[PDB]
Design an enzyme around this catalytic site. Structure first.
Site, PDB file in Angstrom:
ATOM      1  N   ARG A 173       0.175   4.656   2.789  1.00 38.24           N
ATOM      2  CA  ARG A 173       0.293   4.510   4.250  1.00 38.24           C
ATOM      3  C   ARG A 173       0.632   5.747   5.091  1.00 38.24           C
ATOM      4  O   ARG A 173       0.614   5.675   6.315  1.00 38.24           O
ATOM      5  CB  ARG A 173       1.271   3.402   4.566  1.00 38.24           C
ATOM      6  N   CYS A 225       0.836  -1.122   0.000  1.00 36.79           N
ATOM      7  CA  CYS A 225       0.000   0.000   0.000  1.00 36.79           C
ATOM      8  C   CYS A 225       0.950   1.274   0.000  1.00 36.79           C
ATOM      9  O   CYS A 225       1.700   1.515   0.931  1.00 36.79           O
ATOM     10  CB  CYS A 225      -0.801   0.129   1.258  1.00 36.79           C
ATOM     11  N   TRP A 264      -9.056   6.243  -0.823  1.00 38.89           N
ATOM     12  CA  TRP A 264      -9.249   6.915  -2.094  1.00 38.89           C
ATOM     13  C   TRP A 264      -8.236   6.482  -3.134  1.00 38.89           C
ATOM     14  O   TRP A 264      -7.164   5.994  -2.814  1.00 38.89           O
ATOM     15  CB  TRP A 264      -9.248   8.459  -1.914  1.00 38.89           C
ATOM     16  N   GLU A 275      -4.244   3.752 -10.810  1.00 37.15           N
ATOM     17  CA  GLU A 275      -5.033   2.480 -10.658  1.00 37.15           C
ATOM     18  C   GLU A 275      -6.120   2.439 -11.689  1.00 37.15           C
ATOM     19  O   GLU A 275      -6.416   1.371 -12.259  1.00 37.15           O
ATOM     20  CB  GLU A 275      -5.697   2.404  -9.300  1.00 37.15           C
TER      21      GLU A 275
HETATM   22  C1  HEM Z   1      -6.020   6.741   1.697  1.00 37.23           C
HETATM   23  C2  HEM Z   1      -5.809   6.457   0.409  1.00 37.23           C
HETATM   24  C3  HEM Z   1      -5.194   5.218  -0.051  1.00 37.23           C
HETATM   25  C4  HEM Z   1      -4.435   5.152  -1.179  1.00 37.23           C
HETATM   26  C5  HEM Z   1      -4.133   6.257  -2.173  1.00 37.23           C
HETATM   27  C6  HEM Z   1      -3.983   3.752  -1.245  1.00 37.23           C
HETATM   28  C7  HEM Z   1      -3.220   3.327  -2.280  1.00 37.23           C
HETATM   29  C8  HEM Z   1      -3.009   1.999  -2.566  1.00 37.23           C
HETATM   30  C9  HEM Z   1      -2.589   1.506  -3.797  1.00 37.23           C
HETATM   31  C10 HEM Z   1      -2.222   2.306  -4.997  1.00 37.23           C
HETATM   32  C11 HEM Z   1      -2.519   0.141  -3.670  1.00 37.23           C
HETATM   33  C12 HEM Z   1      -2.085  -0.855  -4.708  1.00 37.23           C
HETATM   34  C13 HEM Z   1      -3.343  -1.226  -5.433  1.00 37.23           C
HETATM   35  C14 HEM Z   1      -3.261  -2.191  -6.608  1.00 37.23           C
HETATM   36  O1  HEM Z   1      -2.417  -2.129  -7.533  1.00 37.23           O
HETATM   37  O2  HEM Z   1      -4.161  -3.091  -6.687  1.00 37.23           O
HETATM   38  C15 HEM Z   1      -2.920  -0.195  -2.358  1.00 37.23           C
HETATM   39  C16 HEM Z   1      -2.913  -1.516  -1.872  1.00 37.23           C
HETATM   40  C17 HEM Z   1      -3.379  -1.762  -0.600  1.00 37.23           C
HETATM   41  N1  HEM Z   1      -3.690  -0.861   0.340  1.00 37.23           N
HETATM   42 FE1  HEM Z   1      -3.944   1.061   0.114  1.00 37.23          FE
HETATM   43  N2  HEM Z   1      -4.311   3.084  -0.175  1.00 37.23           N
HETATM   44  C18 HEM Z   1      -5.157   3.809   0.565  1.00 37.23           C
HETATM   45  C19 HEM Z   1      -5.826   3.422   1.709  1.00 37.23           C
HETATM   46  C20 HEM Z   1      -5.817   2.124   2.240  1.00 37.23           C
HETATM   47  C21 HEM Z   1      -6.584   1.697   3.374  1.00 37.23           C
HETATM   48  C22 HEM Z   1      -7.551   2.607   4.120  1.00 37.23           C
HETATM   49  C23 HEM Z   1      -6.217   0.371   3.654  1.00 37.23           C
HETATM   50  C24 HEM Z   1      -6.620  -0.522   4.730  1.00 37.23           C
HETATM   51  C25 HEM Z   1      -7.144  -0.040   5.871  1.00 37.23           C
HETATM   52  C26 HEM Z   1      -5.260   0.021   2.646  1.00 37.23           C
HETATM   53  C27 HEM Z   1      -4.701  -1.184   2.538  1.00 37.23           C
HETATM   54  C28 HEM Z   1      -4.163  -1.611   1.330  1.00 37.23           C
HETATM   55  C29 HEM Z   1      -3.858  -3.048   1.132  1.00 37.23           C
HETATM   56  C30 HEM Z   1      -4.109  -4.212   2.055  1.00 37.23           C
HETATM   57  C31 HEM Z   1      -3.413  -3.147  -0.101  1.00 37.23           C
HETATM   58  C32 HEM Z   1      -3.024  -4.403  -0.805  1.00 37.23           C
HETATM   59  C33 HEM Z   1      -4.171  -4.864  -1.692  1.00 37.23           C
HETATM   60  C34 HEM Z   1      -3.934  -6.214  -2.372  1.00 37.23           C
HETATM   61  O3  HEM Z   1      -2.969  -6.971  -2.162  1.00 37.23           O
HETATM   62  O4  HEM Z   1      -4.738  -6.562  -3.233  1.00 37.23           O
HETATM   63  N3  HEM Z   1      -4.921   1.142   1.877  1.00 37.23           N
HETATM   64  N4  HEM Z   1      -3.101   0.967  -1.641  1.00 37.23           N
HETATM   65  C1  LIG Z   2      -8.134   0.582   0.068  1.00 37.63           C
HETATM   66  C2  LIG Z   2      -7.581   0.805  -1.341  1.00 37.63           C
HETATM   67  C3  LIG Z   2      -7.243   2.059  -1.829  1.00 37.63           C
HETATM   68  C4  LIG Z   2      -6.752   2.184  -3.162  1.00 37.63           C
HETATM   69  N1  LIG Z   2      -6.409   3.362  -3.651  1.00 37.63           N
HETATM   70  N2  LIG Z   2      -6.610   1.163  -4.004  1.00 37.63           N
HETATM   71  C5  LIG Z   2      -6.985  -0.068  -3.535  1.00 37.63           C
HETATM   72  C6  LIG Z   2      -6.801  -1.191  -4.530  1.00 37.63           C
HETATM   73  C7  LIG Z   2      -7.521  -2.471  -4.275  1.00 37.63           C
HETATM   74  C8  LIG Z   2      -7.408  -3.357  -5.480  1.00 37.63           C
HETATM   75  C9  LIG Z   2      -8.163  -3.106  -6.642  1.00 37.63           C
HETATM   76  N3  LIG Z   2      -8.078  -3.907  -7.745  1.00 37.63           N
HETATM   77  C10 LIG Z   2      -7.231  -4.964  -7.676  1.00 37.63           C
HETATM   78  C11 LIG Z   2      -6.447  -5.216  -6.550  1.00 37.63           C
HETATM   79  C12 LIG Z   2      -5.512  -6.325  -6.479  1.00 37.63           C
HETATM   80  C13 LIG Z   2      -4.704  -6.454  -7.758  1.00 37.63           C
HETATM   81  N4  LIG Z   2      -4.095  -5.219  -8.264  1.00 37.63           N
HETATM   82  C14 LIG Z   2      -6.414  -7.515  -6.168  1.00 37.63           C
HETATM   83  C15 LIG Z   2      -5.542  -8.652  -5.767  1.00 37.63           C
HETATM   84  C16 LIG Z   2      -5.581  -9.812  -6.547  1.00 37.63           C
HETATM   85  C17 LIG Z   2      -4.793 -10.886  -6.183  1.00 37.63           C
HETATM   86  C18 LIG Z   2      -4.834 -12.135  -7.015  1.00 37.63           C
HETATM   87  C19 LIG Z   2      -3.968 -10.792  -5.064  1.00 37.63           C
HETATM   88  C20 LIG Z   2      -3.944  -9.618  -4.298  1.00 37.63           C
HETATM   89  N5  LIG Z   2      -3.154  -9.556  -3.193  1.00 37.63           N
HETATM   90  N6  LIG Z   2      -4.739  -8.570  -4.673  1.00 37.63           N
HETATM   91  C21 LIG Z   2      -6.547  -4.443  -5.399  1.00 37.63           C
HETATM   92  C22 LIG Z   2      -7.436  -0.258  -2.232  1.00 37.63           C
END
Ligand code: HEM
Ligand SMILES: Cc1cc(N)nc(CCc2cncc([C@H](CN)Cc3cc(C)cc(N)n3)c2)c1
Ligand code: HEM
Ligand SMILES: Cc1cc(N)nc(CCc2cncc([C@H](CN)Cc3cc(C)cc(N)n3)c2)c1
Ligand SMILES: C[C@H](O)[C@H](O)[C@H]1CNc2nc(N)[nH]c(=O)c2N1
Ligand SMILES: C[C@H](O)[C@H](O)[C@H]1CNc2nc(N)[nH]c(=O)c2N1
Ligand SMILES: [Zn+2]
EC number: 1.14.13.39
Lengths: 405, 404
Positions: free
Chosen positions: A112, A109, A281, A286
């Site tokens: 953070r 993420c 947000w 993305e």
């Molecule tokens: C406040 C604005 C936030 C922004 C801009 C943000 C941004 C991102 C981005 C760009 C990703 C990668 C997404 C992807 O390629 O699929 C991500 C992943 C993630 N973020 Fe955030 N984040 C935010 C808030 C949060 C919140 C509130 C949580 C949890 C409480 C969180 C937990 C995660 C987690 C667990 C992932 C990994 C998702 C996965 O493996 O699929 N983030 N974040």
């Molecule tokens: C809380 C939050 C904020 C933000 N800006 N973006 C997100 C992105 C969440 C998200 C949206 N679309 C796809 C994904 C991941 C892949 N890029 C989903 C995914 C798939 C798989 C197979 C594994 C994994 N860890 N995560 C995650 C979450």
């Protein structure tokens, strides 16, 4: 130097050592013989009690009462509860702390810097699928806040021995339908063809647009999931336009405001919360790079390049690069005009560098997954590219979990 | 266990079994992954076994694995290590070994070319003067008037009793960077240290942004000597843009030949401390890294202003827009001057094909995802979407410490 990984920033020449990795109690997928950091998916009793003790110690440190009488009393109360029931229960403030820490711990993420600001809705009283729906609408309402987005998580009851899980079947609270066509292509988002088809088997009357919001499939313990349609007024969308390419609006592209992950497991002190949707947000790449331009997603790069009159028959025109820039810009621009919070990949990565420095001081390191942290366009134009990162798993944590069906 | 390697765009899966041939630990452990790190934090029997293993690789490549020649070759090697603590390679083995080091290089996106490598054997080199002549013939050969050809020149191996042959420069062609009293650099801030070494060894410096450096070449246990490359040997390409005609006014240029000159080539336990090698450029190396890195020539701002973009906010994507135009200028100008280059889309497509060839040929392909995926438009290339397994096989190119 120190016997801790040395981490270097090649743009600034600065060095740190990550001492926090020492706290990791869970192995990732790499070994001395081979690195597997690019893989997307890496594939109780006395075991619980040590996870619980560790977590309660984290909690007592974070409020500085470590070694105190309230601390040793809490530990005793937790062993006693595990002793007689095999599980235990978190205090409200323990849950708030654990959920923030799970975010703070997430190596993937980039957002953070905001970790300390997270509204935690406690939904551990929820006893029905209907009630999950109400809690989720509330979450969406609070989080969306008419465009001024607020981070949040809603926590439903934890896994319990014997009884079935709470599960949200959708991967996000808001997703678009993908409809498999007779010519083998997909209308809508190809990412969601399976969930879409599950909604239909479960009684959803499907639409047939490119941007149909899916209903939710919510599963309470030991029941089939039930289907709930989100009222459209709760789902804020942003129609996409470009600041100077006037034809871009004619493409009728749009994206939803709220990124809300709904299928991850939040683990705290060995307790497993299987339904705990969280939202933040968007960072603009993305939407504009992955969701709109992945070949296996909306795949619009060519269509845009053709409207821009680019030479699409040769790679060296850089037509893909130029179109993707413009789609990204359109995303930023349209979200700004609509007053819905969004952050560009420059401002997000600059803030994540600040996060690294805050955490170097507060904890002696920050777990981070370089491949996910570096944005998908313009990588080396952002400071995170030039920054070495150490990836490891700390708990509390969000963990992927297998699909419920 | 064998890792499952998934492509996320196409849904296809392979399993890497080549990694079981790795004899050589990387930086990662189960507690923490260190694969984003640029550098590693870190007797006769051991030489002898890397030797036999390399000799076995060679006979197996020419399909003679078990022949008279194989067994007699293993005995020579044994007989020589037992008596002297070391051995020597036959020219054919050196050729096999150099090609294989390149094939095995996890950070190289150009490995589809691995079999087409001109190898110059310079192990009969006894003086920095002779190193120089060998380097000139390498540049001439490899440059070939813009029709670039991959090449390596292999100087004498390290020996126990003595210092190394080394080329102090990190590339055969590099631009000077001159530090100014007030902290700024003129030229390439990556090359300030080497620039000052050249000056301290008696080089009369220039004062431009693009002064080609001399070579500091060291024969064993002697101070390095300085040699100026004849300007006619060093092909350079002026940068212009196909549509923005003020871009040429920027006065930018880049050299045709990417030639790494500071890495160690390890073959069968032998170590070749000077073994410069070259191919041709992928345009993002020049357009994105060398010209736009903030710690390099850093021209993004200047270009953005010439394009009249709004520079005061990140959300205009002025950086992204300018970078693309710079990359396009490089490809356009290399094409115009008829000097081999490859763009990042074509290069990454060729690498996917390479992965597939190697999967069939060898059961795997070691690759460093962070280095393979280009530094702009990552997810726009197929390699973004490809899982990759990284490990060290030998023959290998390795990093080694600067000699000063
Ligand atoms: C406040 C604005 C936030 C922004 C801009 C943000 C941004 C991102 C981005 C760009 C990703 C990668 C997404 C992807 O390629 O699929 C991500 C992943 C993630 N973020 Fe955030 N984040 C935010 C808030 C949060 C919140 C509130 C949580 C949890 C409480 C969180 C937990 C995660 C987690 C667990 C992932 C990994 C998702 C996965 O493996 O699929 N983030 N974040
Ligand atoms: C809380 C939050 C904020 C933000 N800006 N973006 C997100 C992105 C969440 C998200 C949206 N679309 C796809 C994904 C991941 C892949 N890029 C989903 C995914 C798939 C798989 C197979 C594994 C994994 N860890 N995560 C995650 C979450
Ligand atoms: C023929 C065209 C070639 C192309 C297009 C090419 C492309 C590249 C690129 C883009 C990199 C990353 C460089 C960076 O970011 O600094 C690289 C790294 C490398 N390539 Fe190549 N390559 C080519 C030929 C060669 C040859 C001939 C060799 C050796 C004989 C080689 C060995 C390497 C090695 C060892 C690296 C890692 C260098 C380091 O760690 O600094 N490649 N390749
Ligand atoms: C044979 C070949 C072909 C080609 N297209 N490009 C190259 C690029 C070589 C190169 C040029 N300039 C810098 C580098 C590397 C960093 N990007 C140098 C380097 C530095 C450090 C500290 C470690 C390391 N492994 N490599 C490599 C070589
Ligand atoms: C194979 C590779 O790990 C995969 O495509 C990754 C690369 N980096 C990513 N980074 C983010 N933020 N999101 C992703 O889905 C991915 N995909
Ligand atoms: C910290 C990080 O590993 C470093 O910036 C790497 C990233 N990826 C790279 N990729 C290539 N091809 N060349 C590079 O120098 C780098 N630098
Ligand atoms: Zn690793």
């Amino acid at each position: 130097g120190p016997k801790f990984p040395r981490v270097k920033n090649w743009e600034l020449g600065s060095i740190t050592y990550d001492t926090l990795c020492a706290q990791s109690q869970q192995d990732g997928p790499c070994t001395p013989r081979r690195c597997l950091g690019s893989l997307v998916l890496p594939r109780p009793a006395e075991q619980l009690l040590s996870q619980a003790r560790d977590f309660i110690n984290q909690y007592y440190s974070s409020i500085k009462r470590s070694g105190s009488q309230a601390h040793e009393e809490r530990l005793q109360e937790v062993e006693a509860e595990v002793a007689s029931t095999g599980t235990y229960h978190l205090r409200e403030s323990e849950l708030v702390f654990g959920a923030k820490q799970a975010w703070r711990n997430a190596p993937r993420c980039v957002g953070r810097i905001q970790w300390g600001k997270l509204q935690v809705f406690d939904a551990r009283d929820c006893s029905s699928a209907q009630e999950m729906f109400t809690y989720i609408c509330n979450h969406i309402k609070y989080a969306t806040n008419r465009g001024n987005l607020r981070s949040a998580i809603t926590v439903f009851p934890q896994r319990a021995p014997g009884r079935g899980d709470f599960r949200i079947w959708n991967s996000q609270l808001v997703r678009y339908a993908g409809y498999r066509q007779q010519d083998g292509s997909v209308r809508g988002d190809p990412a969601n063809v399976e969930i879409t088809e599950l909604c239909i088997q479960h009684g959803w009357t499907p639409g047939n647009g490119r941007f149909d919001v899916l209903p939710l499939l919510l599963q309470a313990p030991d029941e089939a999931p039930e289907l709930f349609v989100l009222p459209p007024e709760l789902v804020l969308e942003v129609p996409l336009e470009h600041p100077t390419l006037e034809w871009f609006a004619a493409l009728g592209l749009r994206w939803y405001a709220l990124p809300a992950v709904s299928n991850m497991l939040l683990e705290i002190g060995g307790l497993e919360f299987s339904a705990a949707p969280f939202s933040g947000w968007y960072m603009s790449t993305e939407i504009g790079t992955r969701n709109l331009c992945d070949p296996h997603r909306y795949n619009i790069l060519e269509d845009v390049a053709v409207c821009m009159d680019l030479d699409t028959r040769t790679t060296s025109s850089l037509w893909k690069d130029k179109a993707a820039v413009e789609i990204n810009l359109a995303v930023l621009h349209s979200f700004q005009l609509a007053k819905v919070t969004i952050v560009d990949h420059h401002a997000a990565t600059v803030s994540f560098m600040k996060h690294l420095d805050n955490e170097q001081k507060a904890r002696g390191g920050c777990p981070a997954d370089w491949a996910w942290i570096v944005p998908p366009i313009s990588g080396s134009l952002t400071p995170v590219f030039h920054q070495e990162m150490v990836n490891y798993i700390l708990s509390p944590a969000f963990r992927y979990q297998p699909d419920p069906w």
